[PDB]
Design a protein around this ligand. Structure first.
Ligand SMILES: [Cl-]
Ligand SMILES: [Cl-]
Ligand SMILES: [Cl-]
Ligand SMILES: [Cl-]
Ligand SMILES: [Cl-]
Ligand SMILES: [Cl-]
Ligand SMILES: [Cl-]
Ligand SMILES: [Cl-]
Ligand SMILES: [Cl-]
Lengths: 262, 262
């Protein structure tokens, strides 16, 4: 549709950024797609998908397994894991810290639990995703130069994978609920898709950030009385030290919701 | 071959028992088969296969997960688990106790870890076994009446499954070694296949016993400098209170080894 294309292109001009959008409304089977098959560095958005992979791999009781790690594993952004070296963290605590706070040590422990980047890639391939290309752990995974394929995916692919874990048949009902609750109600989401959403449409998201002014958000959005909307919004700039502005994401989200509520 | 058929039939007459034998020599691709496709109650032999299923399901680190259980789970034969109610047991400790000592509480914890009898059946089906029919947990699983299909398999099928876990491509090299070591050097095996084996041919087995004078043994046998032999010997009697005699199994084993060393 040409109305939203113009609005997204205007955002690109206004913010000096490249924007990639894919949204799918499962109530109506409509989509919004803008550079939906272009690659972007996914940054921390992957943490929600890797937690999906944990849930698929593991029984519910395996989520209680305690993991011990060392001070050397504590990275410069590890707001939960830096305080749990002595006692350890369980798998579910690791997934929560990675999704709710984007803790990078928790994200590395999560990746270790599913076999490293190569194991995460294998899990995505088993789901039918041959586009997403995990290569690195934290902190390198958001630092790739433009043009790398490693640590990238497309808006469409990320949305498709999130839809598979949160609404498809990959996970049991109870595991879907665990994942969605991990993604719900976290402050890291406040300025992004949630900022552009209607107040009663519940947003459960995972944000991402990186150099090149990268700023991303993926989400499941749940309107009252309707089936959910799945969204991926990825964005980047040309130069490594560029600033990002979260309003780009919030405004892109408002365009998506307006397009689905006509 | 008609020579071993006569010898096995003579054992049946001598002991008043029904004997089922399947052995496969992977060095030479020869077999010994006697009622190999008849069903028998497998009794505790399954514990080795269920431990295979644990290894396939779980990462190496998941074997260290601690499991807590209650006094009510402690059965009348639980020589290891009865002493670990307070502190718990890890998954690898559970698999060891089930295989080395035939602990029935450990076997139930093992079954729980792979989804109950139905989960164990699903794992065997994924391996290509559509014959073995797990139904019960301990202690009921060895108590079925003759003619039940539940909790039965055939000599051929049990040997085929043991071969898949211990020598096939189901498990990594390290996991194969864990399984074979769990099965090696346990006293419960001393009077059975090991009693009929040459002294330098290393036997790693899992025994079984039940009412109807049921007495079974499955094993991987490793001659020096050669590829292994996989064996299942199952036996039963007609009446519930019948006694068994381990020499039936040891003598059947000697027939197998003589047949393979001509
Ligand atoms: Cl644990
Ligand atoms: Cl921190
Ligand atoms: Cl948390
Ligand atoms: Cl699942
Ligand atoms: Cl919200
Ligand atoms: Cl006991
Ligand atoms: Cl033990
Ligand atoms: Cl494996
Ligand atoms: Cl031996």
């Amino acid at each position: 549709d040409i109305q939203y294309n113009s609005a997204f292109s205007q955002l690109e001009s206004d913010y000096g950024a490249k924007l990639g959008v894919y949204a799918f409304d499962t109530e109506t089977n409509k989509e919004v797609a803008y550079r939906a098959d272009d690659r972007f560095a996914y940054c921390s958005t992957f943490k929600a998908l890797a937690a999906g992979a944990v849930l698929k791999q593991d029984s519910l009781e395996q989520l209680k397994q305690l993991v011990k790690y060392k001070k050397e594993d504590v990275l410069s952004y590890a707001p939960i894991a830096k305080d749990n070296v002595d006692k350890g963290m369980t798998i579910e605590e690791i997934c929560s810290a990675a999704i709710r706070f984007s803790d990078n040590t928790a994200a590395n422990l999560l990746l270790n639990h599913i076999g490293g980047p190569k194991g995460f890639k294998s899990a995505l391939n088993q789901l039918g995703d041959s586009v997403t290309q995990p290569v690195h752990i934290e902190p390198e995974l958001n630092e790739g130069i433009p043009g790398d394929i490693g640590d990238t995916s497309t808006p469409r692919q990320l949305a498709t994978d999130l839809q598979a874990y949160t609404t498809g048949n990959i996970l049991t009902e109870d595991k879907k609920k665990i994942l969605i609750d991990w993604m719900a109600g976290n402050t890291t989401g406040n300025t992004l898709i949630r900022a552009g959403a209607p107040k009663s449409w519940i947003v459960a998201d995972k944000s991402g950030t990186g150099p090149y002014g990268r700023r991303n958000d993926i989400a499941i959005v749940m309107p009252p009385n309707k089936k959910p909307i799945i969204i991926a919004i990825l964005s980047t700039h040309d130069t490594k030290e560029a600033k990002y502005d979260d309003k780009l994401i919030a405004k892109a989200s408002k365009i998506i919701f307006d397009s689905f509520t006509t």
